[PDB]
Design a binder for this molecule. Structure first.
Ligand SMILES: CO[C@H]1[C@@H](O)[C@H](O)[C@H](OC[C@@]23C[C@@H]4[C@H](C)CC[C@H]4[C@@]4(C=O)C[C@@H]2C[C@@H](C(C)C)[C@@]34C(=O)O)O[C@@H]1C
Lengths: 211, 60, 144, 185, 67
RNA sequence: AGGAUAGUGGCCUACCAUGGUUUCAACGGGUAACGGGGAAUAAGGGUUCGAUUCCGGAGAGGGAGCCUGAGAAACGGCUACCACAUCCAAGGAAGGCAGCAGGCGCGCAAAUUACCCAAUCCUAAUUCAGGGAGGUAGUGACAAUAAAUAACGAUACAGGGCCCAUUCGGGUCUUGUAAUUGGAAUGAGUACAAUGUAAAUACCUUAACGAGGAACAAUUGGAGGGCAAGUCUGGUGCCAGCAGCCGCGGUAAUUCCAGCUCCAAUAGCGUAUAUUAAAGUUGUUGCAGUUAAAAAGCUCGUAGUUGAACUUUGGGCCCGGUUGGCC
């Protein structure tokens, strides 16, 4: 597949010695070497080759996973887009942190531990952003569910006071709930086809499955 | 009026469209050749000149 | 007759008259007020990058009956909060809130187009990949 | 820095692009003269409009104007040179009445078919870019060469073409070469 | 093909009025052993940083870096 | 009148006098203002743009000052302040990329930290040295020029050929046709070799190769009207969505998604912003004002614009530049 293959070149080659950096004309195999010009399109890890038949080295599991979460938000509504980009900038800088947006519409940085959060806050304070940040414990995405088979058939008179809607509420089998997300019971499926597969393999009646 | 827009069912027709695969067609000559055949197709063997010259008439 | 100064050396009264009457053109007045630079979501720019705030569903104008699936977007360069209409079928599922999008002009020098009320921009590229390419499955949205 | 190089467009699109009248009028030219696109015919139209207008705002003057007589003879000179205006009828009215079809027969893609080797303008066209016309002693690889009445008695095959000689042909070698291995075991 | 043609009176006469690259093209005189243009600028500017021969400073850094 | 300057000059100083500019727009404000040659469009007038290859002006973060020198208020000179940043041993010291590249921010938006003085020139004590001045290459679908994607045979004959167009069972020497079939040619490309070149890559040249699906496959927008092109097939059912405007969608959509077919332009085609023509909707050319927007409530009046008629006419003559059926 043509996925994520970047046909580019090299801007400069550098061998590092302390903070000083110098251009390099060529570097043979089996050597530590640095280089520029690909940092913008790089994903903080990967394989660099001059061919498509070569393969990608195994993704380092890090053996240490980014787990601890803390929210991050902007001081000003006008300032929201300015330092929202810096999340990607820091994510490149360290090969573990994964900046994303949580299910609460809120941006979460996930670190390995406590002080790994410490290292990535002064850069947002000073280096990768200038605006201060409000740092708060993360908000989690709960949800509300029932199992207790609501007795009275619910009903609500429409604003016209002409129509009403009768209805009932009751639970769902847990594997069905997974299957709704897992796509086995898929809205893209035909109503007929999806009704057959959910009525027999999973506990359902063909009458309701067709509805 | 109505302002409580419902967006969950966006993409309704596309997400329910019957996915039909493109029918393979013989390779189309093009360039001077296309203008050649296009000129001929509309000035020598015009399949439908019914009533008047017609470019895209269906089954009728 | 004809109600205009017509002397051989009356060009002063003729030039100041045209100069004064020129202001009644809507297009000329915009240039000489700099309203595009001063009073506009775009400072004369043809496009602009923005960050999504919310995905809005707007009723169309009469007699049309549709929901237009716009996105409330903040402009990076001036912070103005606007709306943009995401074209083509779906393509609102293509974008997510708090993502990066490119907003272009929407066709009519202002003048909100079509049955869609209160929106004057359309989305072109989201996160750097063209929405049209995503619609035709030419490319895909990188997870960053 | 570097002195700028002057470049100008050689065509101009019609003001209303979509007119069935002028459209299929130019499709009739396209099919008859084997043009590729209508830029190829817009260019001749832009050249024609330029040349007629320059002769049009100059036809406003008397028969004894230095600009006319000096320019017009040169104008007619190239026209009679190429033959879009024939070797007779060398007058200014004939210039402004000159047809686009008149130009399109002075394209080298016309006269290649006319003196054989083609059996088709499109065969004539393709062999031109197939480097199979010797025009003078130099192969011309354009259709719109605007022939000035000289190479007509010089047009023939390329010296290096197998239709001119000296090469036994790419595939014509290939099939003959592998025929030796194909003749038996 | 069409080009220019220059014919001279003698080899040394040509060697004295012809550009060095033409001589190198014809093998009459070898290309000088010369480093690149960019490094030449570097060493020229490094020379600028020293005033004079620099033997006194080269010795001076030698003794001063000894302790 | 003096001072000062290279020199004139309120340019500065002393004293004097009360001027100077202004409704012909002074002054003040804005300028998304560097000026001009010019660029775009354009019947003609115009209108818009001019940061940008040329000519001047100004600036080298902001001001100010100054040495030097013929020439600088210079900044790839210096000092001070402000602002920023720079290494550090804390003691100091070093700074000006709007030069070349190149690296953040910013944005819709913009290329190599490449090679070379061979060319054009310029500088020097000068053939010789140097020049990120310039030139060459890399990126470059800014724009502009030319122009590959295909010929040639026979496929049910589904066409005036002909014995007067018969019986198209007859080469109907010409027109189209089943992705069924054959022989040529050709670059795109690959690369000997030369070569271009300062050295190269490309161009142009050229051996060996290099086409059958000639997968070496051309796309971009469309098909209700404007506006060229379907009332074709399936789905969708005022939903999705489309649509610059009108408008389509409410269960048989010529407009939505697709497929097929067709149309337009074509290595280009749309979209967005601005602008010109269209726009005689800015008006001098050349608008309109009773009712469509618009004749001021009426009159007076300065500036402005406009302003009756009238003065050497006529007649001759001579010299002297002509077209043509009387060269
Ligand atoms: C590798 O990075 C991964 C893992 O660390 C892990 O899977 C982590 O899980 C976090 C949560 C993921 C849940 C689903 C995606 C939907 C609901 C999400 C959660 C909210 O309650 C459950 C876990 C913990 C939550 C919290 C964070 C609010 C989640 C979240 O991301 O919001 O997500 C990050 C991106």
């Amino acid at each position: 597949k043509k996925d994520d293959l970047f046909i580019k070149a090299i801007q400069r080659v550098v061998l590092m010695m302390g903070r000083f950096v110098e251009p390099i004309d060529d570097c043979p195999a089996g050597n530590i070497i640095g280089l520029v010009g690909i940092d913008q399109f790089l994903l903080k890890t990967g394989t660099l080759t001059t061919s498509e038949t070569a393969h990608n080295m195994k993704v380092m599991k890090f053996s240490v996973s980014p787990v601890v979460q803390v929210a991050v938000e902007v001081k000003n509504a006008n300032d929201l887009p300015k330092l929202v980009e810096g999340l990607k900038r820091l994510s490149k800088s360290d090969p573990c942190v994964l900046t994303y947006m949580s299910e609460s519409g809120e941006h979460i940085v996930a670190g390995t531990g406590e002080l790994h959060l410490e290292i990535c806050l002064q850069d947002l304070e000073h280096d990768h952003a200038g605006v201060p940040l409000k740092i708060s414990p993360p908000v989690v995405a709960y949800r509300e569910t029932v199992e207790s088979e609501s007795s009275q058939t619910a009903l609500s008179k429409s604003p016209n006071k002409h129509n009403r809607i009768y209805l009932k509420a009751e639970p769902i089998d847990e594997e069905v709930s997974l299957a709704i997300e897992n796509g086995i019971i898929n809205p893209r499926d035909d109503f007929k086809a999806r009704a057959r597969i959910m009525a027999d393999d999973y506990g359902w009646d063909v009458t309701d499955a067709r509805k | 009026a109505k302002v409580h827009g419902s967006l969950a069912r966006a993409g309704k027709v596309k997400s329910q469209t019957p996915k039909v695969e493109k029918t393979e067609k013989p390779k189309k000559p093009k360039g001077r050749a296309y203008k050649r055949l296009l000129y001929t197709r509309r000035f020598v063997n015009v399949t439908l000149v019914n009533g008047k010259r017609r470019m895209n008439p269906g089954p009728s | 007759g004809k109600g205009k100064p017509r002397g051989l050396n009356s060009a002063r009264k003729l030039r100041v008259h045209r100069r004064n009457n020129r202001w009644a053109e809507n297009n000329y007045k915009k240039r000489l007020l700099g309203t595009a630079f001063k009073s506009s979501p775009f400072g004369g720019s043809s496009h602009a990058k923005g960050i999504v705030l919310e995905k809005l569903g707007i009723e169309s104008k009469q007699p049309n009956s549709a929901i237009r699936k716009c996105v409330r977007v903040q402009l990076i360069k001036n912070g103005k909060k606007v709306t943009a209409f995401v074209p083509n079928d779906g393509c609102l599922n293509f974008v997510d809130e708090n993502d990066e999008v490119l907003l272009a002009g929407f066709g009519r020098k202002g003048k909100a187009k079509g049955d869609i009320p209160g929106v004057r921009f359309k989305v072109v590229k989201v996160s750097g990949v063209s929405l049209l390419a995503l619609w035709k499955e030419k490319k895909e949205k990188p997870r960053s | 820095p570097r002195a700028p190089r002057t470049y100008s467009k050689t065509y101009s699109t019609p003001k209303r692009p979509y007119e069935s009248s002028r459209l299929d009028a130019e499709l009739k030219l396209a099919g008859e003269f084997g043009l590729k696109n209508k830029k190829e015919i817009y260019r001749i139209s832009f050249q024609l409009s330029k040349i007629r207008r320059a002769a049009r705002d100059l036809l406003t003057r008397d028969e004894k104007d230095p600009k006319r007589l000096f320019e017009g003879n040169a104008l007619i000179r190239r026209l009679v040179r190429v033959g879009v205006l024939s070797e007779d009828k060398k007058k200014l009215d004939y210039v402004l009445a000159l047809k686009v079809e008149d130009f399109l027969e002075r394209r080298l893609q016309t006269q290649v078919y006319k003196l054989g080797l083609a059996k088709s303008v499109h065969h004539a066209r393709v062999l031109i870019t197939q480097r199979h016309i010797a025009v003078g002693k130099q192969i011309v690889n354009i259709p719109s060469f605007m022939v000035r009445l000289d190479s007509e008695k010089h047009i023939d095959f390329a010296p290096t073409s197998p239709f001119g000689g000296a090469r036994p042909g790419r595939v014509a070698r290939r099939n003959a070469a592998r025929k030796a291995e194909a003749s038996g075991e | 093909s069409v080009g220019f043609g220059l014919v001279y009176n003698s080899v040394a006469e040509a060697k004295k009025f012809e550009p060095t690259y033409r001589l190198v093209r014809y093998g009459l005189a070898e290309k000088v052993e010369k480093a690149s243009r960019q490094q030449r600028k570097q060493k020229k500017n490094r020379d600028k940083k020293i005033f004079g021969t620099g033997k006194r400073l080269a010795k001076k850094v030698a003794r001063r870096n000894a302790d």
